[PDB]
Symmetry: none
């Protein structure tokens, strides 16, 4: 009876908002839904040959003037190949770099992350790599509704560099693509808005075959608690 468990029902499709930035400037945005997820590509020639919805990054000639940056971005569109794949399987979001560009990822806020101290890791090519687990996110969301914890992050940032092994793209972050599972942005909003008001709030999970839901703060909290029973959490001493 938990409406939130729909997030994990077999066949449910999440909506992914993709926003691209060249040198920190937004040059593209598209929201997609696909069972096999999506693939960030630079060319449409070999668009739908592989599984996953192809999202084509635009030629920089239509957004910037800096020739030095323009050259780099075109080199990146060139190594993309099959592309950066991102998809969901259960409570996990997986990524895999199918082309030739060294691509790095990080979970962060909705703002383009600055250099800081590096990305969370490099997206693997030989095998899939886990980049987000809904379990800990929901646990942290529950903690947020209790005031003892801040708003949990849900934005995935992918820094795409060249095929060259020496290139250190995270430093300048010239090609950045944010992917936001809109259901997670909504869950945080529901918590942020609903928690500060006694009035019933409405939530749109932005998932397939679903309608917005009006819930009181106590109902939402009880549903988050039960949703936790719908996911895996590894024990300290468990294999």
């Amino acid at each position: 009876e938990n409406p939130l468990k729909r997030l994990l029902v077999p066949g449910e499709e999440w909506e992914f908002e993709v926003t691209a930035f060249y040198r920190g400037r937004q040059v593209f945005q598209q929201t997609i839904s696909c069972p096999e997820g999506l693939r960030l590509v630079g060319s449409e020639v070999g668009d739908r040959t592989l599984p996953g919805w192809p999202v084509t990054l635009p030629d920089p000639g239509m957004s910037l003037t800096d020739r030095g940056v323009m050259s780099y971005v075109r080199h990146v569109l060139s190594c993309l190949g099959g592309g950066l794949a991102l998809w969901r399987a259960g409570q996990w979001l997986w990524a895999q770099r199918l082309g030739h560009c060294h691509t790095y990822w990080a979970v962060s806020e909705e703002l383009l992350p600055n250099s800081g101290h590096g990305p969370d890791g490099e997206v693997p090519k030989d095998k899939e790599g886990g980049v987000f687990d809904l379990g800990p996110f929901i646990v942290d969301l529950i903690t947020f509704t209790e005031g003892s914890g801040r708003s949990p992050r849900y934005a995935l940032w992918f820094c795409v560099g060249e095929s060259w092994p020496q290139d250190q793209p995270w430093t300048k972050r010239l090609v950045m693509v944010k992917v936001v599972p809109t259901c997670l942005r909504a869950l945080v909003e529901m918590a942020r808005v609903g928690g500060a008001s006694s009035l019933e709030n409405t939530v749109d999970l932005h998932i397939s075959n679903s309608h917005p839901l009006s819930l009181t703060s106590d109902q939402y909290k009880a549903y988050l608690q039960d949703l936790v029973e719908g996911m895996d959490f590894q024990g300290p001493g468990e294999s």
Copy 2:
């Protein structure tokens, strides 16, 4: 020429979305249009006796269980009389309390936040009282499209209490009614979506005798700039 000025053409009719809440729970929703505005009432025996479209608030019997709360709400429905009147005249939204219930108002978010703050004021009965001015809204809206300001608020909240002067309804907020001029909700979103793609965007003003509009961010911004000239803004030290 400027399609947005249709919002102010003589005879034009805006659509108002009315949503009522009892003890924080949504119990009614209706969208209405009428040149003489609307009137929130508790009985249908004295509806169409005064100008304004009567919007009847429902018996709490088919939504509430707490006897304490139900008694209070029924008392409120009993003082409404002529009702809470809300209507538009040019760029202003006016309200007047024709019945006996002390009624307080506030312009806020789509969901009214709880706070130690009082209402923006009490709706007067002796005369009409201004509750919303499109002028400042549009100016703030423009500031918003420039990233130099937050998204302007457009949701009107009316807290309806009993006739008793001692009653402090704004504290428990048992009977709340939200009124949203959907054209304003649409204008704010346009300012948000327009920033996602410089191309064409559709904005439905939800007003009479008018088709949805197809505009670009540049056109929308220019029309907002010109719309300002169609409204009054009191100058410093002006009568």
